[PDB]
């Protein structure tokens, strides 16, 4: 599951395509920008518990049993965002380990 | 055509004056700061189209008596 | 330099007015005559309502009436002022200083009030 | 690195800069606004108030007052009750 | 205490009693500016009193920048006279000082932490938002900006007596927290 | 004091063109819907920085008090929620910087601070002044510094 | 026999689809306004967990 | 003047040919109608653009 | 119906005087003269925007300023127009700006 299925589920999902609804009522020759998001390269951290202070710390299983915590691990995905504003330039910013 | 609706508003204020008299288009166009050229002719084609639906009454002869109910 | 820019402007102006001269039906000789003439011409008060208690609280207004001194006409992109000083990002424009004309693209100015 | 502390989000500062540069729409004189409205109506017969505000570039209250002076709202099967720029 | 605050800015509002044409005023006045897209009033400045006034079409004017009450009244009268010279029936009606700002120094560093601890009901110290402590005095409705360097700025006063009284009230308190 | 209806079975539930549940259920009032949306936003913001549920509940109570008090009715909801979250963190003894709250809220730092002042005035309460030791644990852990380094930094700042 | 892996894969399929749906909605609002939405804010972390 | 009337009739033939010689190009991929529509759109801009001229002359 | 800035300069004044002479001679109609002025304004704006690539500087003191309809009317005194190639001194200047 973790090694293959999670990554394959992330990759199988179609890229998100978004555009404005003829904003500004101008000539509107594809003027509304197109935003494209593609998820990639899922990362999992070791099980971690964040305290009331907000300081991350490893979560041992027995501590989870005693304090009624849930044994879970953070899940991170790289996301690539492309902006197409029909300005003849497309910018593909990348967000790492979201 | 928009200037035409503006002329309609002008004659509406003319009714508001109460001095409504049989008029024509040239004097209104002059007093509203507009000229008399073939533009007046195309806008007069539009104006006759208006005379086909002039709920604000614009007749050709002695005219402009808009209000369907009008006594004073 | 500036005269050469002026000649280029002449060419642009004549080219730009040719189409209007065709649209209005006027003969083209008008443009030639215009260029010839243009070149030749160039080369305890409790009751405080009365404000008359103060006088000579203004300055001479004839400067703006005269306008004979040097004049700069341009376009402004940014104009900032911080409590004493006026700052000027004036873009491309023209200047008339001592009759001689100056041409510029970026103009930066600092003045005091 | 996620959710790093930022004083203000980048998109918000860009939007605020654009809005500040544009400024608020100014209340122009009645004559010019009326002339622009009449030309707009000349384009074709029916206008919605939102796009009419965009066309006129006037405050919504002032434009609504001027439009109530001459134009009239008609309830219609297009989508909804909209303004009519014909004075009658 | 031996220290008296000195006024740095005074805000006064006066009604001219007549409607005005902002565009005409902008075109004809000397130092006036009018940007209806930016602000709905006309901003004018006079150097001799060293003040700035905002003039509205309703006939009400606000004068700021004056260091003294007399300077504020004289500047407001000068602005009204300038508008009157432009042909309008400008008058001088219900002139009033809406706000006064004063500044001073206590000449010693202050422990704002102890001050906010002692007067938490009136104090507000947030270094993230603003390094100066904000004190809201009650008996005079004055807001005081107290700084670790000792500078104190008072605002919200209608009369100079309020400024002086507020400083007189705050000085022993600050003396109690001298660093 | 409400209920809601589902699809049920497949027969007369859907009618001429799929009427569904005769309707859509359409429940409640704005004085509760706005508070509900604010609670959802608060939970989202807290989970963004892994805040504990007790701080979330304190934020919810603070927002309820502010919203019913109504001195901040003119301020946009999200700003009130963010300022309430900041105040709850301060009261619980684990303060987050205004920038840290802005990182997880769409509201800018300036608006968050203004709403924070207004909420303090409306509640007639106060928050203890932050100290350098409050942020040492989180800052050092996020920097992955050793415990001795964290102790040294805390001692140096104090 | 469906063990732990396939069952959790089914659930994660559903929840990741929901997460992308929420990102779509949240970003569409801001795009209509013309603001350049932040991806980190769009992601609702609570959904999957 | 009679010759100028004949030239105007020739310009009318030239506009008909241009409008119809391609009311056909559009079909192969109403030209006059499109031109009229384009002319209608400018009117609003022209005046919004134009009265600024009147105030700028007053300003300067 | 344009920006209409350079009309009140040497170039615009010469063009206007020439148009006045032709109008006196009946060679051109006033509508044609106005059209010529409009076309000149367009051409001059484009020419200054495109063919000018020099950066200038100036300093001084300000005595008056005005703003209306996006039109600045600054009035400076004792201005020093400094350029890398030359320096010019002027006792008074009026800067009219638009956008």
UniProtKB/Swiss-Prot annotation, chain B:
Disulfide bond residue pairs: none
Subcellular location: Nucleus
DNA-binding region(s) in UniProt: 1-72
Role summary: Recruits TFIIH to the initiation complex and stimulates the RNA polymerase II C-terminal domain kinase and DNA-dependent ATPase activities of TFIIH. Both TFIIH and TFIIE are required for promoter clearance by RNA polymerase.
Entry similarity comment: Belongs to the TFIIE beta subunit family.
Disease: Trichothiodystrophy 6, non-photosensitive: A form of trichothiodystrophy, a disease characterized by sulfur-deficient brittle hair and multisystem variable abnormalities. The spectrum of clinical features varies from mild disease with only hair involvement to severe disease with cutaneous, neurologic and profound developmental defects. Ichthyosis, intellectual and developmental disabilities, decreased fertility, abnormal characteristics at birth, ocular abnormalities, short stature, and infections are common manifestations.
This protein's name: Transcription initiation factor IIE subunit beta
Organism per entry: Homo sapiens
Gene symbol of the encoding locus: GTF2E2
Curated annotation (Swiss-Prot), chain C:
Impact after mutating residue 53 to A: Strongly reduces phosphorylation. Eliminates phosphorylation
Chain positions recorded as DNA binding sites: 80-81
Localisation: Nucleus
Record-linked SUPFAM superfamilies: Transcription factor IIA (TFIIA), alpha-helical domain (SSF47396), Transcription factor IIA (TFIIA), beta-barrel domain (SSF50784)
Disulfide bonds: none
Residues that bear Phosphoserine: 53, 58
One Pfam short name: TFIIA
Source organism superkingdom: Eukaryota
PTM comment, free text: The alpha and beta subunits are postranslationally produced from the precursor form by TASP1. The cleavage promotes proteasomal degradation.
Gene3D superfamilies named in the record: 1.10.287.100, Transcription factor IIA (TFIIA), beta-barrel domain
Primary role: TFIIA is a component of the transcription machinery of RNA polymerase II and plays an important role in transcriptional activation. TFIIA in a complex with TBP mediates transcriptional activity.
Subunit structure, interactors included: TFIIA is a heterodimer of the large unprocessed subunit 1 and a small subunit gamma. It was originally believed to be a heterotrimer of an alpha (p35), a beta (p19) and a gamma subunit (p12). TFIIA forms a complex with TBP.
Membership in a protein family: Belongs to the TFIIA subunit 1 family.
Protein name, as recorded: Transcription initiation factor IIA subunit 1
Organism: Homo sapiens
Gene name for this UniProt entry: GTF2A1
Swiss-Prot record, chain F:
Main location: nucleus
A Gene Ontology term for the protein's cellular component: germinal vesicle
Keywords: Acetylation, Acyltransferase, Chromosome, DNA-binding, Host-virus interaction, Metal-binding, Nucleus, Phosphoprotein, Repeat, Transcription, Transcription regulation, Transferase, Zinc, Zinc-finger
Residue numbers bearing the Phosphoserine modification: 13
Enzyme Commission (EC) number: 2.3.1.48
Sequence repeats: 45-121
Impact reported for residue 53 to Q: In a colorectal cancer sample; somatic mutation
Residue segments, region Core promoter DNA-binding: 110-114
Tissues showing expression: Expressed in the inner cell mass forming the embryoblast. Not detected in cells from the outer thin layer trophoblast (at protein level).
Subcellular location: Nucleus; Chromosome
Processing and modification events after translation: Acetylated.
Mutation effect (residue 121 to L): Reduces interaction with VP16
Mutagenesis or variant effect for residue 121 to E: Reduces interaction with SSU72. Inhibits interaction with VP16. Inhibits RNA pol II transcription activation induced by VP16 but does not affect basal transcription
Domains: entry comment: The TFIIB-type zinc-binding domain is necessary for the interaction and recruitment of RNA polymerase II to the core promoter, the formation of a fully competent pre-initiation complex (PIC) assembly and basal transcription initiation. The C-terminus is necessary and sufficient for interaction with the TATA box-bound TBP complex and for the formation of PIC.
Family: Belongs to the TFIIB family.
Listed name of the protein: Transcription initiation factor IIB
Source organism: Homo sapiens
UniProtKB/Swiss-Prot annotation, chain H:
Subcellular location: Nucleus
Family as reported in the entry's similarity comment: Belongs to the TAF4 family.
Function, as annotated: The TFIID basal transcription factor complex plays a major role in the initiation of RNA polymerase II (Pol II)-dependent transcription. TFIID recognizes and binds promoters with or without a TATA box via its subunit TBP, a TATA-box-binding protein, and promotes assembly of the pre-initiation complex (PIC). The TFIID complex consists of TBP and TBP-associated factors (TAFs), including TAF1, TAF2, TAF3, TAF4, TAF5, TAF6, TAF7, TAF8, TAF9, TAF10, TAF11, TAF12 and TAF13.
Record disease entry: Intellectual developmental disorder, autosomal dominant 73: An autosomal dominant disorder characterized by intellectual disability ranging from mild to severe, developmental delay, speech delay, behavioral abnormalities, and non-specific dysmorphic facial features.
Complexes and interactors: Component of the TFIID basal transcription factor complex, composed of TATA-box-binding protein TBP, and a number of TBP-associated factors (TAFs), including TAF1, TAF2, TAF3, TAF4, TAF5, TAF6, TAF7, TAF8, TAF9, TAF10, TAF11, TAF12 and TAF13. Component of the TFTC-HAT complex, at least composed of TAF5L, TAF6L, TADA3L, SUPT3H, TAF2, TAF4, TAF5, GCN5L2/GCN5, TAF10, TAF12 and TRRAP.
The protein's name: Transcription initiation factor TFIID subunit 4
């Amino acid at each position: 599951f973790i090694q293959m299925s999670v990554q394959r589920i992330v990759e199988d999902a179609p890229p998100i395509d978004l555009q404005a609804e003829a904003q500004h009522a101008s000539g509107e020759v594809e003027e509304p920008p197109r935003y494209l998001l593609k998820f990639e390269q899922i990362y999992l951290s070791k099980p971690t518990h964040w305290e009331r202070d907000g300081a991350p710390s490893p979560m041992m299983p027995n501590e989870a049993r005693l304090r009624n915590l849930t044994y879970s691990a953070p899940l991170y995905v790289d996301i690539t965002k492309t902006v197409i504003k029909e300005g003849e330039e497309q910018l593909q910013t990348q967000h790492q380990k979201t | 055509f928009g200037v035409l609706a503006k002329i309609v508003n002008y004659m509406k204020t003319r009714h508001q004056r109460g001095d409504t008299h049989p008029l024509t288009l040239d004097e209104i166009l002059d007093e509203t700061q507009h000229l008399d050229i073939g533009l007046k002719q195309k806008q007069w084609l539009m104006t006759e189209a208006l005379v086909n639906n002039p709920k604000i009454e614009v007749i050709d002869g002695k005219y402009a008596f808009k209000p369907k109910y009008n006594v004073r | 330099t500036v005269p050469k820019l002026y000649r280029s402007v002449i060419e642009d102006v004549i080219n730009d007015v040719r189409d209007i001269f065709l649209d209005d039906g006027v003969d083209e000789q008008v443009l030639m005559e215009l260029k010839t003439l243009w070149e030749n011409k160039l080369m305890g008060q409790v009751e405080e309502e009365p404000l008359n208690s103060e006088d000579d609280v203004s300055d001479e207004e004839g400067q703006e009436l005269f306008d004979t001194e040097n004049v700069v006409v341009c376009q402004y992109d940014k104009i900032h002022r911080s409590k004493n000083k006026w700052k000027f990002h004036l873009k491309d424009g023209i200047m008339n200083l001592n009759g001689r004309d100056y041409i510029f693209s970026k103009a930066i100015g600092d003045a005091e009030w | 690195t996620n959710y790093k502390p930022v004083a203000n989000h980048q998109y918000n500062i860009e939007y605020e800069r654009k809005k500040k540069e544009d400024g608020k729409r100014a209340r122009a004189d009645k004559q010019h606004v009326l002339d622009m409205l009449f030309s707009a109506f000349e384009k074709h017969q029916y206008y919605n108030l939102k796009d009419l505000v965009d066309i006129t570039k006037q405050p919504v209250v002032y434009l609504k007052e001027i439009l109530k002076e001459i134009g009239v709202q008609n309830v219609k099967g297009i989508h909804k009750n909209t303004w009519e720029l014909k004075p009658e | 205490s031996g220290i008296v605050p000195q006024l740095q800015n005074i805000v006064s509002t006066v009604n001219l009693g007549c409607k005005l044409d902002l565009k005409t005023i902008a075109l004809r006045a000397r130092n006036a500016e009018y940007n209806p897209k930016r602000f709905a009033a006309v901003i004018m400045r006079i150097r001799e009193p060293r003040t700035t006034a905002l003039i509205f079409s309703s006939g009400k004017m606000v004068c700021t920048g004056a260091k003294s009450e007399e300077q504020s009244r004289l500047a407001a009268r000068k602005y009204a006279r300038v508008v009157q010279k432009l042909g309008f029936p400008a008058k001088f009606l219900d002139f009033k000082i809406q706000n006064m700002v004063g500044s001073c120094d206590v000449k010693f560093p202050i422990r704002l932490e102890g001050l906010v601890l002692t007067h938490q009901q009136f104090s507000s110290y947030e270094p993230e938002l603003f390094p100066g402590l904000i004190y809201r005095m009650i008996k005079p409705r004055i807001v005081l900006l107290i700084f670790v360097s000792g500078k104190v700025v008072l605002t919200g006063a209608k009369v100079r007596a309020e400024i002086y009284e507020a400083f007189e009230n705050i000085y022993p308190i600050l003396k109690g927290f001298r660093k | 004091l409400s209920t809601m209806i589902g699809k049920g079975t497949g027969a007369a539930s859907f009618d001429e063109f799929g009427n569904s549940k005769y309707q859509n259920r359409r429940t409640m009032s704005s004085s509760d819907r706005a508070m509900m949306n604010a609670f959802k936003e608060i939970t989202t913001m807290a989970d963004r920085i892994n805040l504990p549920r007790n701080i979330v509940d304190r934020t919810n109570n603070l927002f309820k008090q502010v919203y019913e008090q109504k001195s901040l009715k003119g301020r946009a909801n999200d700003a009130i929620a963010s300022a309430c979250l900041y105040i709850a963190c301060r009261q619980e003894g684990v303060p987050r910087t205004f920038k840290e709250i802005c990182a997880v809220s769409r509201i800018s730092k300036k608006e968050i601070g203004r709403c924070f002042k207004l909420i303090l005035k409306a509640l007639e309460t106060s928050v203890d002044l932050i100290t350098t030791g409050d942020f040492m644990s989180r800052f050092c852990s996020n920097l992955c510094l050793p415990k001795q380094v964290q102790m040294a930094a805390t001692h140096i700042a104090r | 026999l469906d063990l732990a892996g396939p069952l959790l894969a089914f659930l994660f399929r559903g929840m990741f689809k929901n997460l992308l749906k929420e990102v779509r909605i949240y970003a569409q609002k801001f795009i209509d306004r013309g603001k350049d939405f932040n991806l980190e804010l769009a992601i609702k972390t609570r959904i999957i967990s | 003047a009679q010759l100028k009337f004949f030239e105007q009739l020739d310009q009318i033939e030239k506009q008909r040919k241009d409008e119809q010689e391609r009311e056909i190009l559009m079909r192969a991929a109403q030209l006059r109608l499109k031109q009229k529509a384009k002319e209608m759109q400018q009117q609003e801009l022209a005046q919004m653009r134009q009265r600024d001229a009147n105030l700028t002359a007053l300003a300067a | 119906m344009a920006y209409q800035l350079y009309r009140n300069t040497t170039l615009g004044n010469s063009l206007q005087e020439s148009l006045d002479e032709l109008i006196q001679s009946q060679q051109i109609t006033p509508q044609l003269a106005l059209q010529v002025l409009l076309q000149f304004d367009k051409a001059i704006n484009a020419a200054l925007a495109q063919r000018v690539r020099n950066r200038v500087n100036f300093r001084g003191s300000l005595n008056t300023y005005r703003f209306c309809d996006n039109v600045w009317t600054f009035v400076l005194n004792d201005v020093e127009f400094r350029e890398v190639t030359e320096l010019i001194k002027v006792d008074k200047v009026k800067i009219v700006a638009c956008d």
